[PDB]
Design a protein that fits this description.
part of a larger assembly; 6 chains; A mainly alpha (50); B mainly alpha (121); C alpha+beta (118); D mainly alpha (51); E mainly alpha (52); F alpha+beta (200); C: 118 residues; alpha+beta; 3 helices; D: 51 residues; mainly alpha; rod-shaped; binds magnesium ion; RNA-binding; Large ribosomal subunit protein eL13 (chain D); ribonucleoprotein (chain C); phosphoprotein (chain C); structural constituent of ribosome (chain C); ribosomal protein (chain C)
Amino acid sequence: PSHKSFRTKQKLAKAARQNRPIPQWIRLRTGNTVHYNMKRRHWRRTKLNI
Amino acid sequence: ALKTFELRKQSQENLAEQLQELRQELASLRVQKIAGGSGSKLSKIKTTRKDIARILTVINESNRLAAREAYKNKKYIPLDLRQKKTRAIRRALTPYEQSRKTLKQIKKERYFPLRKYALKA
Amino acid sequence: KVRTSTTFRRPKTLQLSRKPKYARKSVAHAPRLDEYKIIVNPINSESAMKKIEDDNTLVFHVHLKANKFTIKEAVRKLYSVEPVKINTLIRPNGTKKAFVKLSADADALDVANRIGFL
Amino acid sequence: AIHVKGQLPNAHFHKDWQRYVKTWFNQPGRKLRRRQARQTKAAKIAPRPVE
Amino acid sequence: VDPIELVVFLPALCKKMGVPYAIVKNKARLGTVIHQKTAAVLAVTEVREEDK
Amino acid sequence: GAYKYLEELAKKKQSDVNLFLSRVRAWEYRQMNVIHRASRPSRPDKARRLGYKAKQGYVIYRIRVRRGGRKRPVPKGQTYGKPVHQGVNHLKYQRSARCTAEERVGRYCSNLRVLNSYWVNQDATYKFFEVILVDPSHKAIRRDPRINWIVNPVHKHRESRGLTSIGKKSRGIGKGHRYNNSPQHATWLRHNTLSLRRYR
RNA sequence: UUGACCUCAAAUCAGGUAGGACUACGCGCUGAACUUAAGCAUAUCAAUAAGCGCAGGAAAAGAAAAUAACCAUGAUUCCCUCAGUAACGGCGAGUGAAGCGGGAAAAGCUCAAAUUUGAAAUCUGGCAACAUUUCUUUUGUUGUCCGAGUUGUAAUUUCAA
RNA sequence: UUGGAUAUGCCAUAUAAAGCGCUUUCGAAGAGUCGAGUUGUUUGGGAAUGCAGCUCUAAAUGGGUGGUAAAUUUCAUCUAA
RNA sequence: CAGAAUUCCGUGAAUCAUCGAAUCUUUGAACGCACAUUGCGCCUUUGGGUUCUACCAAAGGCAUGCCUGUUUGAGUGUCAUU
Ligand SMILES: [Mg+2]
Ligand SMILES: [Mg+2]
Ligand SMILES: [Mg+2]
Ligand SMILES: [Mg+2]
Ligand SMILES: [Mg+2]
Ligand SMILES: [Mg+2]
Ligand SMILES: [Mg+2]
Ligand SMILES: [Mg+2]
Ligand SMILES: [Mg+2]
Ligand SMILES: [Mg+2]
Ligand SMILES: [Mg+2]
Ligand SMILES: [Mg+2]
């Protein structure tokens, strides 16, 4: 709401950070299956639920 | 990489001075990293960070040994200097407390101890 | 033993202060957040550059637990300049940004160059 | 229902008996443990008789 | 004597045995004689010839 | 000595002396807290024979416990079951009121170990008990071989597990044919465990 | 007036201690109904599920206010047996132990009640010194003083005596 | 790492504490507990197996147990709180 | 992917193994009081800025029940001496 608590704001920062593509060299590692992730959250699609 | 055996030979004040120099240097490496930098300085950030840790460890080692010295042969010692086993082990009866016996029990063990014996066929 | 009030109150007694037989903590901790923790890095975005050369103000990434008092002292101790006002904001990424305006007797551009982020 | 030859049935299995079934798969293991304890005790109290 | 049962039988016991007895004030005063805080009872067994 | 006289006199609870003392002490007890510290045992002879000693680390606490049965704590006498379980009023707690006295004092003195307890008084509303407690952290206890055992962690809250004198009585712990139900659950397990051997 | 004693307070007093978690196994409290009885209420499911308290490496039990009725046995626990037996049961459905015997393992003891009374012989704490260490982290010894304690701390005894 | 061996080589523990042995007079032994009634619960426990409430409430060769209620008399065995 | 050959016949690589010294943010039984608040206080010492009382910073502290002990007390509870 723009009226928000500090605790809420900290969580929003973290949520935005986890909402990023993985760098390719992570998936290029020998023995890694990080090629695609089901954790790509979008604001209209899947809600944070605080 | 600073050598820790060389660090232990220095006084606490000189170590505190050396630490400030390392922190000032680490701040410079980070500023340069933001405004473009080669890979040697990037590897120098990690080395400088570990050098700061080495100095902090020596300073703390020296301080703790001084505290152990100040509290040698004292009944009550700082908590972080006492045993760190388990909570239950700290509360257990001491071997001395466990081995206490009444006079009646002491006499019994003195006069009727279990013997060594054998049966010959 | 004259009581002129119908209310008994607890009499005052000595209340000694603590005289421990041992310090609970052997070694006092060094100052947390002195000056190398308070100032994390200069910020050199385009908007920060305009703040430097138009309003004589520096932009710093600072520790979340720094306040306007400690940011002022840290800048004075680290870069030997005297801020006149400090404004602070917590960015949407969760990190703290400080707008450090310098006095009219110092040039922010020169300070920026001396730090080396220009 | 009851219609076959033989004894009227008596089986006491109306509680949750499968919860408390005791198997004996450790029977040779227990036997080995007990023998090893006897050997350990005999060497400790020697030359006293074990019994 | 605050739990009085500790001494409530003593006058009957003293009377039965024919030993003189007196009830006196302050277990605390009796204790002072024997270097203690209090004493429930004191007994005189022997007294020197000069105090007979 | 005096202890034999105190023991015999304690048996005469209907005598004029004991009736009077009981009345004044019960009145005095009702004036203080439900649980309160006793400076000394009100029954020194009874306390000694239950393990108490007049040394540092032994503590006496007094407590009053409401008398009578256990009303079933169900909302409006409603039990939601078969008529055999519809009882609300004339029910009884399986543990003695003395056991409850020990439980509550033990919680009140969570640094101590409950040793034993004894009756001291009663009116229509309350029974009064004195609970003997021992400090396992005190050096006078830890260096004493006769009470040392209680320091070991197996004796933690022995009153809560029915391990005091009154706790074992309420558990029906005893020898011989009258106590065949024994420790109930352990005995029950032995009789309800189907033993399936390797027949080879 | 002071002091003693008693009882009762207060302190960020000196030093300790409890709580929370783990619950397979362990000690208790509380406590159903589905179900079976070809219906159903006693019964059964079950002294079970759920609920609550409390432990340990095991727990609990334990050195007889025990068996027996013998030529007697001899703390406790566990196994096999006793035994689907004696017994309980709308004697319906169903339920159901124990002594002996064989075996695993074995271990025995402590107080309270006694006048040390030609000697509180007992204990904690502080301080100091001296030792000690899984360990500068551990554990004690002596001295001294103060407290505890005669409303009883030690010592000989615990019925087998 | 005295656990065992000559556990040697030696510390110096070791002077006053236990064993049996005749004779005596003795021999303190746990109380709102046991026990009784009654109510509830529980048990295979049957005119109550254990537990609990309430009422009554002990004794000194007494008291408990001896699986059919009671009164008496024996016997055996154990020794609670 | 590099980078680092200020090292590789070496107290020295390694997300190596092991591990007896340390560090160990905000919390949580969670302990100054709170908490949909990075909210509101108190104490000790040391520093800063004119400040022995305001303000700022740092270090160390401040929960509850209970136990042993200490100190300071309370009572027309019980006493002795003046
Ligand atoms: Mg703002
Ligand atoms: Mg036991
Ligand atoms: Mg049916
Ligand atoms: Mg049907
Ligand atoms: Mg139906
Ligand atoms: Mg359950
Ligand atoms: Mg454990
Ligand atoms: Mg045990
Ligand atoms: Mg015996
Ligand atoms: Mg059944
Ligand atoms: Mg007895
Ligand atoms: Mg029930």
